[PDB]
Amino acid sequence: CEIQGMLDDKGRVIEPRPNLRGESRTFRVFLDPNQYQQDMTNTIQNGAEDVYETFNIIMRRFKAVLETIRNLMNTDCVVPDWLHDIILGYGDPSSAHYSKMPNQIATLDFNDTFLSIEHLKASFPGHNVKVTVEDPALQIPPFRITFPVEAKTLIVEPHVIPNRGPYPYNQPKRNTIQFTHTQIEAIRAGMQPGLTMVVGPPGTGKTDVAVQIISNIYHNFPEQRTLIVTHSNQALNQLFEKIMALDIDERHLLRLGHGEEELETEKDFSRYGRVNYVLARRIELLEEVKRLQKSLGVPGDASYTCETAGYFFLYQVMSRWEEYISKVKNPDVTEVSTFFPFHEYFANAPQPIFKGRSYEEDMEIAEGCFRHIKKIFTQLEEFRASELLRSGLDRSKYLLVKEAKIIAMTCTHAALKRHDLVKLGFKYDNILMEEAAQILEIETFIPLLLQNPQDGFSRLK
Amino acid sequence: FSVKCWLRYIEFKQGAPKPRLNQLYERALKLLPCSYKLWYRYLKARRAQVKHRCVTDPAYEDVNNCHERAFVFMHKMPRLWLDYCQFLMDQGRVTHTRRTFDRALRALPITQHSRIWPLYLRFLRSHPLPETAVRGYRRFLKLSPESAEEYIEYLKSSDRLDEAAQRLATVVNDNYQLWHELCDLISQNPDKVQSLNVDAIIRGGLTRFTDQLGKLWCSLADYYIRSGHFEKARDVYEEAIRT
Numbered sequence: 001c002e003i004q005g006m007l008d009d010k011g012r013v014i015e016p017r018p019n020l021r022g023e024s025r026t027f028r029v030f031l032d033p034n035q036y037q038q039d040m041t042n043t044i045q046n047g048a049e050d051v052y053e054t055f056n057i058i059m060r061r062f063k064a065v066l067e068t069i070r071n072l073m074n075t076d077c078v079v080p081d082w083l084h085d086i087i088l089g090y091g092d093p094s095s096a097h098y099s100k101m102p103n104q105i106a107t108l109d110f111n112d113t114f115l116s117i118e119h120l121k122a123s124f125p126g127h128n129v130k131v132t133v134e135d136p137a138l139q140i141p142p143f144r145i146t147f148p149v150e151a152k153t154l155i156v157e158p159h160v161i162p163n164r165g166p167y168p169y170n171q172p173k174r175n176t177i178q179f180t181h182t183q184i185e186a187i188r189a190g191m192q193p194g195l196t197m198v199v200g201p202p203g204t205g206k207t208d209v210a211v212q213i214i215s216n217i218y219h220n221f222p223e224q225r226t227l228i229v230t231h232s233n234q235a236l237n238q239l240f241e242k243i244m245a246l247d248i249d250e251r252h253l254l255r256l257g258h259g260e261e262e263l264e265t266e267k268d269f270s271r272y273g274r275v276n277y278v279l280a281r282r283i284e285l286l287e288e289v290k291r292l293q294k295s296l297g298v299p300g301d302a303s304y305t306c307e308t309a310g311y312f313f314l315y316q317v318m319s320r321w322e323e324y325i326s327k328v329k330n331p332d333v334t335e336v337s338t339f340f341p342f343h344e345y346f347a348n349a350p351q352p353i354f355k356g357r358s359y360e361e362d363m364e365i366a367e368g369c370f371r372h373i374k375k376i377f378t379q380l381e382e383f384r385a386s387e388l389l390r391s392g393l394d395r396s397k398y399l400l401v402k403e404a405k406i407i408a409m410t411c412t413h414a415a416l417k418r419h420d421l422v423k424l425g426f427k428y429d430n431i432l433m434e435e436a437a438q439i440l441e442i443e444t445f446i447p448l449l450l451q452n453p454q455d456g457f458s459r460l461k
Numbered sequence: 462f463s464v465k466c467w468l469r470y471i472e473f474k475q476g477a478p479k480p481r482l483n484q485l486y487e488r489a490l491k492l493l494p495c496s497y498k499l500w501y502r503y504l505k506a507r508r509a510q511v512k513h514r515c516v517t518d519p520a521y522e523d524v525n526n527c528h529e530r531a532f533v534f535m536h537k538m539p540r541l542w543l544d545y546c547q548f549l550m551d552q553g554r555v556t557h558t559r560r561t562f563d564r565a566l567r568a569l570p571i572t573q574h575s576r577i578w579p580l581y582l583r584f585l586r587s588h589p590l591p592e593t594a595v596r597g598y599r600r601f602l603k604l605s606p607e608s609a610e611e612y613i614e615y616l617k618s619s620d621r622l623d624e625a626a627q628r629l630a631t632v633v634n635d636n637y638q639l640w641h642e643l644c645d646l647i648s649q650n651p652d653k654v655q656s657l658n659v660d661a662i663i664r665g666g667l668t669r670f671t672d673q674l675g676k677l678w679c680s681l682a683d684y685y686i687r688s689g690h691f692e693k694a695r696d697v698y699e700e701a702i703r704t
Contacts (some may be wrong), residue, residue, distance in 0.1 A: 093659065314566070314567075315568055319528065319567040323525070330518075330521050
């Protein structure tokens with residue numbers, strides 16, 4: 001009996017209980033999903049006596065697992081070909097890793113763990129670090145790091161995360177903790193196809209490894225989904241607290257729970273609070289696109305919504321942007337400053353973004369500002385679902401199934417609410433999980449049925 | 462401010478026609494766009510004049526002429542963009558498709574829908590990435606329940622059954638049902654004779670659309686000449702006798 005509270009003056013369970021007249025208590029509780037399901041089975045199918053209604057007394061200090069077993073067993077149970085064998089032990093157990101799934105990332109984003117290329121040159125102690133170009137005033141990038149399949153060179157090439165406009169506020173977030181060498185190898189063995197169990201000794205930052213994995217997977221796959229699963233709420237709370245310093249938009253973050261839980265980190269990831277915050281962010285995007293419309297200088301006395309905002313973006317901003325494109329890629333440092341009608345738009349921004357000296361730098365600035373207005377229209381594309389979903393829980397599910405690529409879930413909670421997740425968008429292309437030994441074999445295999453096969457094959461990577 | 466003198470400076474502009482187009486766009490977007498027909502015939506005559514030269518600066522000046530003639534937006538700048546689309550359909554480079562589709566769907570009308578969707582059709586030829594990608598983005602793009610239907614009927618003609626079934630799924634999730642039936646029959650032609658695809662397509666089609674025993678008995682003859690002889694076939698034919 002997971003008790004919510006006792007009887008009051010108005011017969012309702014507690015949530016300052018009222019004037020407790022007398023020494024009786026009549027309290028309602030709800031232990032689990034399948035709480036009134038085992039007695040239902042006994043009264044309906046086996047026709048045996050009553051367990052939940054034969055009551056005698058109460059004393060203080062499961063069937064959800066059995067229903068999950070029944071479902072997973074009587075479905076196709078098509079598991080990932082690299083993990084079903086590693087779960088039944090048959091097959092060489094060095095196989096579920098990266099070095100025995102064939103499709104290793106040719107060159108992945110090893111961005112976060114390294115913030116100095118000399119640091120990465122140390123943290124690659126057994127590979128010949130082939131860094132492309134030789135200016136150390138030019139090499140500390142989110143480099144591309146190919147490890148080949150001679151055959152042991154760390155092929156690091158520079159990269160430049162593209163602009164986002166004039167503003168120095170969105171300076172794209174890079175990590176700060178220089179995780180270990182085998183820890184970066186943990187991140188890589190997780191972000192490449194296979195399986196990975198990190199042996200995290202006390203204090204080593206298994207949760208830092210998890211935050212690194214979240215970041216690197218959001219980098220090397222913008223579209224595939226991440227189920228970050230825990231044994232207790234500590235993992236999800238701490239990993240959210242840590243990823244609060246990474247390059248994630250809050251339209252890509254969501255979670256599950258086991259019922260009632262109070263937000264343990266700074267900002268809410270929860271259902272109603274998240275829909276409300278995204279409604280406020282939608283107001284932000286609407287006012288942004290609208291002041292951009294006034295920057296374009298059209299007439300009109302009433303304001304528009306998400307659909308008209310997206311169509312109007314593609315109709316006006318994209319048209320002007322194609323004009324500037326056919327002026328710039330057809331192109332002086334004068335026209336890279338002038339020929340952008342974003343002067344009225346970045347006229348609420350720092351001093352002109354096309355510096356008027358380096359045509360290519362002015363081009364980066366102009367395309368970054370246009371792509372920023374396109375990210376305004378893109379968060380408008382995301383708020384399409386906020387304006388299409390009717391209820392708070394409805395918009396929670398819609399925004400977690402549609403755009404939120406990072407869903408943090410608890411073990412028994414997701415084992416209890418997996419069916420709803422399967423039906424309304426359980427997308428498990430990648431799993432990142434914490435508190436490994438803090439679960440069981442049951443709480444490790446019951447999540448293995450969050451979906452149905454995809455033409456004879458599972459969703460796992 | 463006489464459109465006469467404007468067309469006169471355009472059609473008397475000699476030498477390089479680049480000062481022609483620059484001063485033309487300047488003055489034309491300065492004053493009103495009543496010279497629409499003048500600039501249109503001018504663009505066509507200029508195509509007659511320069512279509513033998515490099516397609517870089519003349520076609521650029523023409524696109525500029527059309528987008529600038531589009532004072533705010535109008536019903537003939539999508540038209541001239543469609544003239545450039547049909548003219549560069551013989552591209553050899555898909556940047557023509559990209560830029561022409563941008564220019565023509567610079568609005569959201571019935572215009573350039575049937576210019577982009579057959580452009581995705583002529584994209585699907587030996588590279589299914591643009592086909593299925595435009596299929597997805599259009600199914601999740603400017604809303605019209607007929608566009609995704611047309612998408613299923615387009616992927617019906619190319620050898621990616623997943624794209625047809627994908628548009629079918631999108632429309633059934635949200636003639637169209639009959640067109641989904643036609644695409645189901647197209648992928649149900651007796652090639653995958655494992656006896657799975659045609660039968661499942663029969664069930665899905667007869668689920669979304671109701672035929673009173675017609676397609677039922679079609680699938681009946683199919684699956685009963687494709688059935689077995691053991692308990693499977695005994696039971697299948699008994700169930701068909703009962704249903």
